[PDB]
Each structure stands twice: as C-alpha cells, then as structure tokens.
C-alpha cells in the first residue's frame with residue numbers, strides 16, 4: 001500500500017548512486033517529472049537517527065548551487081523461509097536535472113577551442129558558490145566529481161547527490177585517515193577546475209594527467225596557458241588541508257571578474 005506507486009508514474013531508472021536507486025518519475029497530480037532517490041535505512045535504531053538527522057538538515061537548504069528539494073517520505077512493505085529481517089525505505093523527491101552531467105559535457109568537448117576560459121570559470125564559480133554555502137551551514141559535500149555535477153533543464157550548474165552516506169577527485173585524508181575537515185571539498189574543486197580548463201582526448205591519458213596534477217605535477221602547456229589558475233589549483237591541491245583556501249577566498253579571487 002506504498003505512497004510512491006499510487007502517487008507517481010515511473011518513466012525510467014537513471015542509476016544506482018551510492019548503491020541507492022534513482023528514478024525519473026511523474027507525480028500524477030502536478031504532472032511534473034522528478035528525480036526520486038530511494039535507499040534502505042540501516043536497521044540499527046541508533047544509525048537511523050543519524051540518517052534522519054541529515055534529511056532534516058538538507059531539507060532547510062535553499063541555494064542556486066543546490067538541486068531544489070520537494071519531499072521525503074518513508075515506506076514499510078510487509079513464503080521465503082523464516083528470516084523476517086525488517087526493511088524500511090527512505091524516498092527523497094528532487095528537481096529532475098538533465099540526464100547528462102559535467103563529465104558528459106566534458107566528454108563532448110575534447111579540444112582547446114571547445115573549452116573557452118570564460119565558460120569553464122562560469123561553471124566552476126557556480127560549483128564553488130554551492131560548496132561555500134554548504135560549508136557556511138556546517139556541512140561538507142565529499143562527493144564532488146563531474147559524474148555528480150548536474151545541469152537544470154535551464155542550464156544552471158548544480159552540485160549533485162550528497163549526505164545520507166571513483167576516488168580520483170578524493171583527497172588523501174578522505175581515502176584513508178577518515179577524520180577529515182570540510183577542506184576535502186577544496187581538493188576536489190582543485191582537480192575539477194584543472195580538468196575544465198584542460199581537455200582530454202582519451203580516458204587513459206586523463207587518469208594519467210589527473211594523477212600527475214593530484215601530486216602537483218602540471219603539464220607545462222597548462223601552466224603557461226593559464227598561470228593564475230595554476231597558482232589556485234596548486235593551493236587547492238595542497239597536501240595539508242590548512243594551507244588550502246576556504247571556498248569564500250577562491251570565489252573572491254580576481255580571476256572571477258567577468259560577465
């Protein structure tokens with residue numbers, strides 16, 4: 001007797017993000033399509049109050065870098081053997097963004113003349129201003145990767161799924177030594193800003209050149225081409241979080257004086 005099937009008309013599955021299913025589905029009443037994320041909560045009554053704390057905090061979020069929230073409800077569906085094992089589902093209804101994301105955008109633009117310094121920065125600033133907002137509400141994203149950077153049907157850049165918890169964008173302290181600061185986010189931004197400015201022909205050559213930059217090894221053409229941005233991306237990829245800039249400081253940099 002589940003609220004989803006009765007009140008939403010499925011369209012397609014979009015992925016299984018964080019081992020949780022995400023559906024494009026039309027609300028029968030308002031006749032609008034929505035991205036509907038569904039996870040099973042942990043069974044621990046302790047580690048549920050954890051997840052239920054996050055959703056209450058995320059529902060307060062209002063910013064132009066943050067995918068518009070609509071609703072979040074719970075469903076318990078009541079043969080096999082004699083393990084009952086109770087399974088409660090958390091549904092989160094969000095604004096449906098484009099099926100294609102910043103990696104899709106990047107994949108279809110593998111030449112210098114297709115990566116205008118102007119446009120790349122404009123995409124980065126929208127990400128940074130979202131990460132800043134999150135940090136200011138005492139949250140971190142810890143999930144920044146082109147794969148998970150979306151566009152609204154209106155081409156507003158959005159930071160993708162986060163909260164309710166590839167590693168090429170992850171920070172050293174995030175992968176291992178798992179008591180990290182919010183500055184893990186600044187590491188990810190660092191690689192992303194670089195990647196936007198630096199088009200990649202082939203996936204192997206990307207993974208190589210990102211792994212280089214990740215260890216402060218920068219293609220000599222990139223440094224010469226974009227000198228200010230080089231300076232920034234070094235700081236963002238600083239091995240000590242403390243020496244990495246706060247999103248507010250990145251945003252207020254000269255580089256972003258244009259419209």
Ligand SMILES: Cc1cc(NC(=O)[C@H](O)c2cc(F)cc(F)c2)ccc1-c1cnc(N)c(C(=O)NC2CC2)c1
Pocket residue numbers: 014015016017022035036037055058059061062066067068069072092094095096097098099150159160161162163
């Ligand atoms: C499902 C989904 C969740 C969020 N969640 C938050 O941002 C955050 O968890 C939050 C929760 C809250 F309750 C409130 C918030 F303000 C934020 C953001 C975006 C999408 C999404 C939207 N449209 C899409 N087309 C897709 C898509 O194509 N996904 C496939 C897997 C790759 C995903």
